[PDB]
Amino acid sequence: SPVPGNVIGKGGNAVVYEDMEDTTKVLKMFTISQSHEEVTSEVRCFNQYYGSGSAEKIYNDNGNVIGIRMNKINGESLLDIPSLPAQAEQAIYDMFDRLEKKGILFVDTTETNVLYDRMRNEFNPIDISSYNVSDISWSEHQVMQSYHGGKLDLISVVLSKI
């Protein structure tokens, strides 16, 4: 029922293909079974940030989750952009403000996980997940310190390129 085109992304848990039934979507097909909380929170974070209808689960016959059909995101990898305009500074703050406003504590703040769209001057995160405060493993303090560090680090990368 999903119709995959060319590979456009590889990850530790998934291969991302064009959706041949819809130019605006991609198919993130899991290479091994994910926990329900992982799938659900990926879909939720993506819909929260990009808008409702932006991500949905793909099911097989047995009713297992085999993937996520998601919006293709605009922009080019920040890895491939040596140099940014001064105005990109406010753009990386805007991204973080939009995430925080939703109560998402963006985890993966690496250069690999962000796209920059120079025409619109916006940064778009690719894989969105949040820290989750829990008993003993992740306290509010640990989360805040980790989140803050990753935010400063990505902002630092952006400012270095300006």
Resolution stated for this PDB structure, in Å: 2.3
Roughly how many angstroms between the first and final C-alpha of the chain, as a whole number?
A: 45
Burial (0-12, 13-18, 19+ Cβ within 10 Å), 61: exposed
Stretch (H or E) spanning 148: helix 140-160
Q: Would you say 8 and 33 are in contact if contact means Cβ atoms under 8 Å apart? A: no
Question: Candidates 3.40.1160.10, 3.30.200.20, 3.40.710.10, 3.40.50.300; correct CATH number of 1-72?
Answer: 3.30.200.20
Q: Which residues pair with 19 in a beta bridge?
A: 4
Question: Candidates 1.10.510.10, 1.10.150.120, 1.10.600.10, 3.20.20.80; correct CATH number of 73-162?
Answer: 1.10.510.10
Q: Which residues of 87-121 are buried (b: 16+ CB within 10 A; e: fewer)?
A: ebeebbeebbeebeeeebbbbebeeebbbbeeeee
Q: Would you say 9 and 16 are in contact if contact means Cβ atoms under 8 Å apart? A: yes
